């Protein structure tokens, strides 16, 4: 039913179109990557604090010394990708605001979409495609996807308004 | 000796028309008690000339050449029709079948893309009276059909088409429509084109032709939406007779 | 393209003010140190 | 008039885009004249009524139907194995009231264009050269400032 | 709703007669003509020619009439095109042609039966989403 | 009749005035059309310039 | 002190500002050769025939599109799988109308990206840290070889992988959810969880270890500043964290060790994407997701529509209008 | 384009052979602890 | 114009590119 | 001025009846005995003058005269038109199911 | 026609304005022809010259 | 009016960008 409603929004609001969403698919992957390297970066500047293999056993939870190299972990970032955090802070304060602004973002968009006040179309593209019909991009091409489902999903989706959609009128490319 | 398709693959030979001998002068002789067809033309464009607009007074713009951007896609091969002789002893080739067209697209300077139907859809080419025999100074001239680059189902990018489509411009819901009514309304060209197909080798033993072709015709105008350029296209044919 | 005119004067200062507001602040940073 | 300028759906606030800007005079054009109430016949004289666009759908197919909710016309995408056009149905347009009252009008391409204003409900005449109105629906001040204060909530 | 004996009850000739069959032949049926049919004909259609389905009243129209148990029994025995002309049992399935088909081998009699009592039950059920395709799915 | 100084060209001029006619899409300023001028187009002054 | 030698040293010194190594020394060149191809295609390149039908789509800027509609275009289908580069064409002309930039950019793509994975193995071994950072980056870059070349591979063409832009990477996303039910394969599921769970955890310990920042500044100055680069102490308290985010659930579902915690981060979104990576790469071979299509019902055997046909219904017109124009026979096999 | 395509062939064995012979200068010994 | 601006908007963080790794405050040690 | 010429042929009898000169092949499956023998060799000669022009197609055997006799009020013909006939599209117009 | 072009005051640069910017197009336009040389008479049939 | 449109941001950075320039001086003064 979930999958149904991510469908229903792409068809009729143009859901991902719209720049509220994108920034929330921003916070949720960024969020995400800096999940996975935040991680793996601690993992991988560990001090050798014990003799075992399983490198877990070394870690007691009331010691006072960091587990792992804030000042490798500096360096390898800063040649590797360029720029690297250096306060430890504000690295865990940047993972707590990424993905919770990313959402704020996203619920925004959503109380747009209440009042179907979309980022439906852009109004330039359509005078020139209207005018031009040699004109194509991949937003007219993705439009006529949202066509498609609305018409093929609306009778069985909204039965409560007895739509009845005669073939001949179903939009349809060559064949398909 | 003849090559096989696992010679020929990737090459480009297989959009060649086959060639002659420069030493195929000989002549075909006409008994008109028989009947003749064409077993296989094979028409190979090589030059694809775009006429200008002048846009001021009486200039008449030329032709300019263009660049091909489609590839080794463009010659019409294994076509055949009736050879009939007439009561004047010209002959009259009568298309019948065969791959008789192809989409082509070239581009002028500018940046200027002009998609034709390179075609002899229907094509009637005559020779003068009094053949007798097919010489290395026969010519035949015809002319033929050139249909809608796009047949009736095709669907512009808003959705729009003639045999299919919507029939308004959809996103623009209270758009004043008569600005828009060519683009809404989609129409079918039928023009026609002609060619010269001028004989330069015979090989009389085997009934084998090849030579030049000139052909005029018009360029795509997408269902209506603008209107055409002219095309001149020259190239090189090849022919195979055969006693019906 | 027939674009909304006022989007460029609305992405110019988009850019403009808060950038320049930014740079204020840290300009006067400096030369407190 | 004033009643009949309620009835149509570019004055609905749900019909509107977050980016598309000013007043609704922008979109559809300053409204001038009710051109009059559309009345749809076949070829056997049934009243035929058309579907009226949903809010939800930023476009809809043209289905003409009978007082019984039967599919008697449209305006077919495929045309090949068509049933329902206005052509094969001999649909026909006259009109009651407002600027159009009296008049009706047989030729299918203008049928289907009144048609087409149909399914937004009662039909108008509107100026869009004044305000160079581009012909998309915008929302009223309703829905500018429920959205404004619903995200500011 | 449920298979009651009246949905069950099919045409078995041209002079109307007419045959009831069991809830096991219609279940019988149905396994057999996804084993042997279906992969061309899932839903009533026909994937490698959709001109012609399985339609009641598309078979009604062909010659020998097909919309009765003799009629498809028949069919699997002998096909022809839609007009009678030719026997077309090379390229489609059929007993005549069980060598170069070989999932008609094994077909008996009273097989055939319950295959044909399918196709004749189930727009009975379905209804325009036999041989509609997927405009009705 | 629409000659560059109609247009308001200013650099095109000085460009052209020293021997650059010819652009890459095959124009050239004196009308030819089919024309091939090599790296030392309109184009290719102004991306040497970049870099 | 041999010429070998020291560029030797150099390629592999780590007191270069940005490091190099052999794995950069292919990175570098093929990472310029895409970036520099992709902006100008972006910005000036003319429309593409994508689907080999002789319909160019417009994808850059200066042919009408903005930043979310723009994009480089994939190579025409009539190309399929061949090898397009710059000198099989017979013009820079023929070569744009059909796509090639597409190719020149993914392919020196994936190679300079490849070589970012062991670039940073081989750093990690010049520094003496562990070696498992690029471990990690195989999920992001197992993801970027399934869009960009194994979906291509199984489907038959570069047209079909996902092109290079905003509006089109949405254009990708709905054909694929038509021809394979994306949404509906477990892979892709695992994906969601992977990225949702990721952005979850990044958020949960942002918030914990912010939570017990131990009081090292005044109320008028940034908490940040109560951590000093290289200072060797810690700068919360995790056994404050554990005592409240044990309480918050129960004892024994919060960590107390440290190492556990942060392999923990590291390994559910990386997990969770190689999955997804490889439901791409799978679908690519058309093994799809879950069909429920007419699963159930009744006694009589009517349909009795469930949430999965309502989907299918959206898909059937997604299906029906992709590439309205590409389609001649009734099955869309690829 | 012969000559871009001989251009490409020789930068492109250039740096490949550059990567070859990189890894097989003794690339274990450069680390910061063992070297043998 | 609004080519102008996307191209102008993107050349601006390539630079920011350079000067955020070229001149960033150097992290120093305790 | 501008009209799209298959939605004026639905208003002529073309959109009633099987136009012998325009209408796709799939639709001679609709009246029994038609298909595919007879809809082959009608399509192929085309084009008529007039609906009983179908009975003078060579070759016809007397059982072929006699199915095309009984079904000669459900065909009709109108002038070609060159957007339904093009393309091969009275064999395959694109539409299956 | 070119050589009429140039016999025009539309071309000569001294008919301009310090604020009226862009090209010469956007002011007189984008000339499309020659309309040809205009002789005037009077009713006795005399050639007459405009200033 | 028919005015020409560009001078609505001609005369917006004309007052912007020279003013700030002076505001960044002056507060940078005061800060040292
Ligand atoms: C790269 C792909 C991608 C990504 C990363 C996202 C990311 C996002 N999408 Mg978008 N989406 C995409 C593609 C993508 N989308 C596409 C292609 C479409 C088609 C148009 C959509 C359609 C779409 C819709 C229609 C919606 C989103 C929404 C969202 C957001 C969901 C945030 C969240 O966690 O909600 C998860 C839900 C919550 C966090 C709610 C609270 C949950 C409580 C705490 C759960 C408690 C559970 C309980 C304790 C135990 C239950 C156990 C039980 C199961 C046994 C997020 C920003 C949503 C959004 O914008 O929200 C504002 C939304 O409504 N997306
Ligand atoms: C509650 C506030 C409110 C509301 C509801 C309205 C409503 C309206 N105004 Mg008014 N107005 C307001 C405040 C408001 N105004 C204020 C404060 C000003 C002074 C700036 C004006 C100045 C003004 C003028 C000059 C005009 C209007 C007009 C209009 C009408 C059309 C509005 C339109 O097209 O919106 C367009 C709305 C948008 C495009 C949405 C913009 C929201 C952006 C996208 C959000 C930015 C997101 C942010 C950067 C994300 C970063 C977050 C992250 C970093 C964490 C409408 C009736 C017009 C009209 O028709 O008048 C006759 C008109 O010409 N208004
Ligand atoms: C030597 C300099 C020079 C010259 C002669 C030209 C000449 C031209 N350019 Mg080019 N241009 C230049 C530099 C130059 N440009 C530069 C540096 C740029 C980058 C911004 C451009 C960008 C550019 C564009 C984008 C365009 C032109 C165009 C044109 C044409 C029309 C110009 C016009 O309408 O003027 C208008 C000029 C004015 C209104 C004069 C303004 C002077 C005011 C009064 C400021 C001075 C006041 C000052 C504050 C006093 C302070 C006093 C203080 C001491 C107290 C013309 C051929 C146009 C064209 O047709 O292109 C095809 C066009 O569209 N140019
Ligand atoms: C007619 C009538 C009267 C009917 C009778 C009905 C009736 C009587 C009703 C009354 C009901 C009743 C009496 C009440 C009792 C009912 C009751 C028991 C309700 C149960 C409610 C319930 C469903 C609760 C939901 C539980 C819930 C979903 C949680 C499950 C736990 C869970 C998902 C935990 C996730 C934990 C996880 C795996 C990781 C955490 C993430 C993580 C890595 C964080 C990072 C991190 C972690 C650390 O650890 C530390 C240290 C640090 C630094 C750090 O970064
Ligand atoms: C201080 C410096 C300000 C610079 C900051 C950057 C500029 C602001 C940029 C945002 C505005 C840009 C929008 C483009 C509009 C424009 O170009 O057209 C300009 C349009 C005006 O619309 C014009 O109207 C004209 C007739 O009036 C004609 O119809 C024109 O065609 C039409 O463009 O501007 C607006 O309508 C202004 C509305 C402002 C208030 C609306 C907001 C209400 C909803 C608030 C939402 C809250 C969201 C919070 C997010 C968290
Ligand atoms: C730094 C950031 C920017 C700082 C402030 C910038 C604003 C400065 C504004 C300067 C004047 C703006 C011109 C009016 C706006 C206008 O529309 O112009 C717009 C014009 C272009 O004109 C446009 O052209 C279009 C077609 O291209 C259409 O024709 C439009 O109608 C027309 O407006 O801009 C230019 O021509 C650029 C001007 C630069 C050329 C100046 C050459 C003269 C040099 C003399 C210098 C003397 C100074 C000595 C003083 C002591
Ligand atoms: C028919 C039945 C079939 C049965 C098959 C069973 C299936 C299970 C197969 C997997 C086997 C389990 C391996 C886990 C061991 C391990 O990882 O040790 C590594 C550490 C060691 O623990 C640490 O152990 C340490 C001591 S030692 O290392 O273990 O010696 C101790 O110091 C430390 O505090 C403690 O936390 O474990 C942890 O830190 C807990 C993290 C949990 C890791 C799970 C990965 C999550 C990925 C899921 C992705 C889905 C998202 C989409
Ligand atoms: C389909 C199954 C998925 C494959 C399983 C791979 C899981 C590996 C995690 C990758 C994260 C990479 C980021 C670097 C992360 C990194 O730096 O980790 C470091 C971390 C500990 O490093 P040590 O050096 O202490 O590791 C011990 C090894 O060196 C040998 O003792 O590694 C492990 O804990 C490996 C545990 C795997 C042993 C159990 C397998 C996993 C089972 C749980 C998941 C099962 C699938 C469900
Ligand atoms: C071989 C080449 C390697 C690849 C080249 C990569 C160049 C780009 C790297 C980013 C430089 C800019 C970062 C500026 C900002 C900056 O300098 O950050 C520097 C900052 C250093 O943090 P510290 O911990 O030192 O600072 C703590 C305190 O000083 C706070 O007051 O780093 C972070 O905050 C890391 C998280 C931000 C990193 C997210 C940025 C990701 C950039 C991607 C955005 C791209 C948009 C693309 C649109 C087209
Ligand atoms: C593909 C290999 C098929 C298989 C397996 C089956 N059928 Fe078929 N069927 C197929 C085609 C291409 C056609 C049209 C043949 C023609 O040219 O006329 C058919 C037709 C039928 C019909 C007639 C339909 C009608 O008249 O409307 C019937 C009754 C039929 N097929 C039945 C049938 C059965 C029972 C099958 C399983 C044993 C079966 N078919 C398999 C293609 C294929
Ligand atoms: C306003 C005005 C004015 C002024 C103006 C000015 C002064 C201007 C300037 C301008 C300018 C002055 C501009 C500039 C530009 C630049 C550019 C645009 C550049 C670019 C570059 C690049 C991009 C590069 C890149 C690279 C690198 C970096 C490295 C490596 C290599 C390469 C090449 C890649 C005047 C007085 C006239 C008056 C009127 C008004
Ligand atoms: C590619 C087709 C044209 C051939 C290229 C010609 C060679 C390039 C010549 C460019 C002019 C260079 C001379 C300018 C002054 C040189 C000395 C200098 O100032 O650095
Ligand atoms: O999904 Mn549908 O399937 Ca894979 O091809 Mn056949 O059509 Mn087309 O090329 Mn792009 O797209
Ligand atoms: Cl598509
Ligand atoms: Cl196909
Ligand atoms: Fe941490």
Redesign the interface.
């Known amino acids: 039913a979930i999958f149904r409603f991510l469908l229903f929004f792409q068809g009729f609001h143009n859901w991902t179109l719209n720049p509220f969403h994108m920034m929330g698919v921003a916070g949720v992957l960024g969020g995400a990557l800096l999940c996975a390297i935040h991680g793996a970066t601690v993992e991988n500047t560990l001090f050798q604090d014990g003799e075992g293999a399983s490198t877990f056993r070394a870690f007691n939870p009331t010691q006072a010394e960091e587990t792992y190299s804030m000042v490798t972990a500096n360096r390898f970032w800063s040649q590797i990708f360029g720029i690297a955090f250096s306060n430890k802070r504000w690295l865990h304060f940047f993972m707590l605001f990424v993905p919770v602004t990313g959402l704020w973002m996203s619920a925004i968009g959503v109380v747009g979409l209440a009042l179907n006040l979309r980022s439906y179309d852009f109004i330039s593209q359509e005078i020139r495609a209207a005018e031009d019909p040699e004109f194509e991009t991949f937003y007219t091409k993705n439009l006529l996807l949202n066509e498609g489902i609305r018409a093929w999903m609306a009778p069985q989706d909204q039965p409560h308004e007895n739509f009845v959609f005669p073939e001949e009128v179903l939009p349809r490319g060559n064949a398909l | 000796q003849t090559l096989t398709y696992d010679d020929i693959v990737g090459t480009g030979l297989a959009n060649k028309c086959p060639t002659l001998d420069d030493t195929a002068r000989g002549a075909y002789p006409i008994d008109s008690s028989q009947t003749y067809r064409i077993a296989r033309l094979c028409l190979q464009p090589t030059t694809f000339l775009v006429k200008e607009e002048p846009k001021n007074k009486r200039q008449e713009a030329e032709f300019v050449p263009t660049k091909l951007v489609t590839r080794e896609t463009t010659s019409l091969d294994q076509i055949q029709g009736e050879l009939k002789v007439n009561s004047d002893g010209s002959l009259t080739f009568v298309e019948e079948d065969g791959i008789d067209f192809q989409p082509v697209t070239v581009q002028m300077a500018g940046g200027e893309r002009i998609p034709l139907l390179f075609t002899v859809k229907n094509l009637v080419a005559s020779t003068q009276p009094n053949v007798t025999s097919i010489t290395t100074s026969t010519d035949f001239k015809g002319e033929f059909n050139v249909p809608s680059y796009r047949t009736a189902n095709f669907l512009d990018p808003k959705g729009r088409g003639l045999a299919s489509g919507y029939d308004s411009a959809i996103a623009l819901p209270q758009a004043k429509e008569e600005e828009l009514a060519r683009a809404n309304v989609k129409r079918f060209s039928l023009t026609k084109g002609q060619i010269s197909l001028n004989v330069a080798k015979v090989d009389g033993r085997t009934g084998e032709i090849a030579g030049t072709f000139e052909s005029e015709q018009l360029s795509d105008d997408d269902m209506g939406a603008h209107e055409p350029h002219e095309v001149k296209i020259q190239g090189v044919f090849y022919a195979s007779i055969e006693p019906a | 393209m027939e674009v909304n005119q006022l989007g460029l004067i609305a992405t110019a200062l988009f850019v403009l003010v808060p950038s320049v507001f930014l740079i204020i602040l840290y300009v006067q940073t400096e030369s407190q140190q | 008039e004033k009643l009949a300028f309620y009835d149509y759906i570019g004055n609905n606030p749900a019909k509107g885009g977050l980016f598309r800007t000013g007043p609704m005079n922008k979109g559809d054009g300053i409204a001038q004249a009710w051109k009059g109430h559309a009345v749809f016949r076949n070829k056997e004289g049934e009243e035929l009524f058309v579907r009226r666009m949903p809010a939800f759908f930023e476009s809809f197919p043209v289905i003409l139907t009978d007082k019984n909710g039967v599919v008697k016309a449209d305006i077919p995408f495929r045309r090949a194995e068509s049933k329902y056009s206005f052509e094969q149905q001999g649909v026909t347009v006259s009109f009651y009231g407002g600027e159009l009252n009296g008049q009706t009008f047989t030729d299918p391409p203008t049928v289907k264009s009144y048609a087409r204003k149909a399914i937004f409900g009662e039909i108008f005449e509107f100026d869009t050269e004044t305000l160079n109105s581009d012909g998309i629906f915008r929302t009223s001040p309703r829905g500018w400032f429920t959205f404004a204060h619903a995200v500011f909530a | 709703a449920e298979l009651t004996p009246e949905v069950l009850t099919v045409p078995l000739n041209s002079e109307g007669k007419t045959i009831t069959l069991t809830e096991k032949q219609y279940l019988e049926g149905k396994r057999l003509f996804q084993y042997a049919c279906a992969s061309c004909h899932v839903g009533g259609i026909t994937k490698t020619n959709p001109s012609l389905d399985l339609r009641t009243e598309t078979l009604a129209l062909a010659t020998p009439p097909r919309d009765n148990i003799e009629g498809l029994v028949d069919y699997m025995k002998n096909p022809t095109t839609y007009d009678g002309e030719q026997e077309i049992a090379e390229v489609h399935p059929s007993l005549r042609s069980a060598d170069i088909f070989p999932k008609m081998r094994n077909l008996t009699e009273k097989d055939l039966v319950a295959i044909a009592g399918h196709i004749l039950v189930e727009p009975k059920i379905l209804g325009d989403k036999w041989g509609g395709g997927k405009v009705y799915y | 009749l629409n000659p560059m100084w109609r247009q308001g060209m200013f650099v095109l001029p000085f460009m052209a005035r020293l021997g650059v006619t010819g652009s890459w899409s095959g124009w050239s300023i004196t009308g030819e059309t089919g024309i091939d001028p090599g790296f030392w187009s309109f184009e290719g002054v102004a991306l040497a310039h970049i870099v | 002190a041999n010429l070998?030698?020291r560029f030797?040293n150099w390629?592999?010194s780590?007191d270069?500002?940005?490091?190099v190594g052999?794995?950069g020394?292919?990175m570098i060149?093929t990472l310029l050769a895409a970036t520099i191809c992709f902006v100008i295609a972006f910005?000036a390149a003319?429309?593409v025939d994508i689907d080999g039908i002789?319909?160019?789509?417009?994808?850059s800027?200066?042919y009408?599109?903005?930043?979310?509609?723009g994009?480089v275009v994939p190579s025409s289908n009539?190309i399929g799988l061949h090898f397009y580069?710059?000198?099989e064409?017979?013009?820079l002309?023929?070569w744009?109308?059909?796509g090639g930039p597409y190719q020149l950019i993914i392919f020196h793509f994936l190679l300079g990206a490849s070589c970012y994975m062991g670039?940073?193995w081989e750093?990690?071994?010049?520094?003496?840290?562990?070696?498992?950072?690029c471990?990690?980056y195989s999920?992001?870059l197992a993801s970027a070889f399934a869009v960009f070349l194994i979906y291509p591979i199984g489907q038959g063409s570069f047209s079909d992988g996902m092109?290079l832009?905003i509006?089109?990477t949405?254009?990708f996303?709905?054909?694929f959810?038509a021809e394979h039910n994306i949404?509906?394969h477990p892979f892709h599921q695992l994906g969601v969880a992977?990225?949702?769970?990721?952005?979850?955890?990044?958020?949960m310990?942002?918030?914990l270890?912010?939570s017990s920042?131990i009081r090292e500044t005044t109320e008028t100055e940034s908490?940040?500043y109560?951590?000093?680069?290289?200072?060797?102490?810690?700068?919360?308290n995790?056994?404050a964290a554990?005592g409240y985010f044990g309480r918050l659930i129960f004892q024994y579902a919060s960590f107390?060790?440290?190492?556990?915690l942060?392999?923990?981060?590291?390994?559910?979104?990386?997990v969770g994407?190689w999955f997804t990576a490889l439901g791409i790469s799978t679908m690519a071979f058309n093994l799809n997701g879950f069909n429920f299509?007419?699963s159930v019902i009744?006694?009589?055997?009517?349909?009795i529509?469930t949430?999965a046909?309502?989907?299918?219904?959206?898909?059937?017109?997604?299906?029906?209008?992709?590439?309205?124009?590409?389609?001649?026979?009734?099955?869309?096999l690829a | 384009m012969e000559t871009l395509k001989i251009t490409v062939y020789i930068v492109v064995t250039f740096f490949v052979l550059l990567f070859v012979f990189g890894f097989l200068s003794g690339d274990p010994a450069r680390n910061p602890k063992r070297k043998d | 114009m609004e080519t102008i601006t996307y191209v102008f908007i993107f050349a601006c963080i390539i630079a920011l590119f350079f000067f955020a790794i070229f001149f960033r405050e150097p992290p120093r040690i305790t | 001025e501008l009209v799209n010429v298959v939605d004026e042929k639905l208003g002529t009898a073309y959109g009633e009846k099987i136009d012998l000169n325009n209408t796709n092949i799939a639709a001679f499956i609709q009246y029994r005995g038609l298909y595919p023998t007879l809809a082959k060799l009608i399509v192929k000669n085309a084009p008529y003058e007039s609906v009983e022009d179908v009975l003078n197609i060579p070759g016809l055997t007397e059982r072929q005269k006699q199915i095309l006799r009984e079904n000669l009020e459900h065909f009709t013909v109108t002038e070609v038109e060159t957007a339904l006939v093009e393309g091969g599209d009275r064999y395959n117009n694109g539409l299956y199911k």
Request: proline share 6%; with cysteine.
């Open positions: 070998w030698e030797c390629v592999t780590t270069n500002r940005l490091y052999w794995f020394v292919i060149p910005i003319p429309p002789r319909e160019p789509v417009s994808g800027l200066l009408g599109n903005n930043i979310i509609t994009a009539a580069p710059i000198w064409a017979a013009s002309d023929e744009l109308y059909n670039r940073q750093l990690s071994y010049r520094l003496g840290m562990r070696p498992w950072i471990v990690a999920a992001p092109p832009g509006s089109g949405f254009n996303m709905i054909v959810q949404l509906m992977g990225v949702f769970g990721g952005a979850l955890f990044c958020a310990h942002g918030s270890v912010t920042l908490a940040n109560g951590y000093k680069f290289g200072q060797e102490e810690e700068t919360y995790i056994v554990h107390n060790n440290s190492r556990s942060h392999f923990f981060l590291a390994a559910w979104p990386v994407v299509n007419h009744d006694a009589k055997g009517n349909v529509n949430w046909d309502i989907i299918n219904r959206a898909n059937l017109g997604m299906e029906v209008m992709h590439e309205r124009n590409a389609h001649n026979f009734p099955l869309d």
